[PDB]
Ligand binder design. Structure first.
Ligand code: NAP
Ligand code: BLA
Ligand code: BLA
Length: 316
């Protein structure tokens, strides 16, 4: 300490990190690596840091102790691996990797190098998920559950989140959909999935995708995971429904209600706080005082495992 940080990426997540790292006594933002020249210059000017020429040069820099990986999904695996070999602590924005196999390597590698390997999961710090668990008890045995997120976007940009290789399998990239269910109900017994893309004229990109996963949990629960975004969607949704034999929990965006006997009581849901700030501090609290992190790497790797299985169910 101060934990000297190099940041890989200059996007939204990378900026929230820079803000907290800088403003936090225990940490020192040292370097960063980006992509486009404009945003590498914006990031450098905004935060007072100079950019490495390559991410390889960033992770080998002896004057950083921790690599923060907030770049495109496709690069998570190789960069996390190179940084662990180079003896750095590695914090990643999810997904850990684009395949379950690669994530297992990183876990094993980080173990045998004695370095922190943490995957951020801000969906587990949000109002919806905390309210779901504040209230899970009073709806009995959850037998039927669905989480639909539909993000219509017309036109679809030819940015990295619509690129097959850089984004990866959509349910691997949108790991927070499955992660929620595994955090609440544990091991999945059975996996069925379908994915369908609408290509761009340049088919490296897609203008839309619909990914559906049908999960059967060991404890009897049936769960539906619906992820869709792009040009063919005309109605947005962010709906989490949980049917128990004692009641129903429904969360529509950030509003929640408990439903018992065909009647509903409103549920208070927490503010859209700096979830990135919570995570950053959780990392700095763990590295200094040993306070356990709010999510385990094991749980993150398990979410990827279920998601990787969804990618096999789709032939992908
Ligand atoms: N709330 C969140 O945003 C959120 C939450 C959870 C996890 N994550 C994880 O965030 C990582 C960062 O995502 P984001 O949401 O911050 O996206 P973003 O704002 O688009 O930032 C991505 C960074 O992408 C770099 N980049 C883009 N294309 C690249 C390429 N082809 N090769 C190398 N670098 C490239 C961007 O380049 P330019 O300089 O060209 O912009 C910039 O440096 C992903 O794992 C994302 O899923 C994000
Ligand atoms: C408007 C553009 C916008 C972009 C480009 C964006 C990127 C983005 N947001 C994500 C999750 C998330 N993104 C946010 C919040 C934000 N993220 C933001 O970029 C911004 C500006 C906010 C909020 C003002 C949250 C809370 C999650 C967690 C979602 C969850 O709980 O599942 C993810 C991870 C993959 C996924 O779950 O789909 C990405 C790539 N989010 C956006 O809202
Ligand atoms: C042009 C606006 C706008 C867009 C394009 C948008 C889309 C959007 N919201 C996302 C996550 C998210 N973004 C937010 C929240 C916000 N997001 C915000 O832009 C703001 C101000 C909040 C404020 C709370 C949330 C809650 C998610 C949750 C996960 C989801 O809905 O998929 C993602 C995930 C990553 C991806 O696959 O690209 C996208 C595209 N939301 C938008 O509001």
């Amino acid at each position: 300490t101060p934990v000297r940080v190099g940041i890989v990426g200059t996007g939204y997540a990378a900026q929230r990190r820079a803000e907290v790292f800088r403003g936090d006594r225990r940490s020192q933002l040292v370097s960063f690596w980006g992509n486009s020249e404009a945003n590498t210059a914006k990031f450098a000017d905004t935060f007072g840091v100079r950019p490495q020429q390559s991410w390889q040069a960033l992770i080998n820099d002896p004057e950083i102790d921790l690599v923060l990986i907030a770049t495109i999904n496709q690069l998570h695996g190789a960069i996390a691996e190179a940084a662990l070999q180079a003896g750095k602590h590695v914090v990643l924005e999810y997904p850990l990797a684009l395949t379950y196999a690669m994530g297992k390597k990183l876990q094993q590698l980080a173990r045998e190098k004695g370095k922190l390997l943490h995957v951020e999961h801000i969906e587990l710090l949000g109002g919806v998920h905390q309210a779901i668990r504040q209230n899970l008890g009073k709806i009995g045995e959850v037998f039927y559950a669905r989480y639909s997120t539909i993000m219509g976007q017309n036109p679809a940009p030819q940015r990295w989140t619509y690129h097959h290789q850089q984004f990866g399998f959509p349910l691997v990239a949108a790991l927070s959909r499955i992660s929620r269910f595994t955090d609440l109900f544990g091991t999945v017994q059975q996996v069925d999935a379908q994915c369908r893309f609408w290509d761009q004229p340049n088919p490296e990109y897609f203008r839309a995708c619909l990914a559906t996963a049908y999960l059967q949990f060991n404890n009897g629960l049936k769960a539906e995971v619906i992820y869709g975004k792009g040009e063919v969607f005309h109605q947005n949704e962010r709906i989490f429904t949980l049917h128990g034999d004692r009641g129903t929990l429904i969360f529509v965006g950030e509003t929640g209600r408990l439903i018992q006997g065909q009647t509903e009581t409103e549920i208070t849901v927490g503010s859209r706080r700096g979830l990135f700030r919570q995570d950053t501090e959780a990392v700095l609290d763990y590295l200094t005082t040993g306070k356990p992190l709010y999510v385990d790497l094991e749980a993150s790797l398990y979410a990827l495992e279920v998601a990787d299985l969804c990618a096999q169910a789709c032939g992908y």
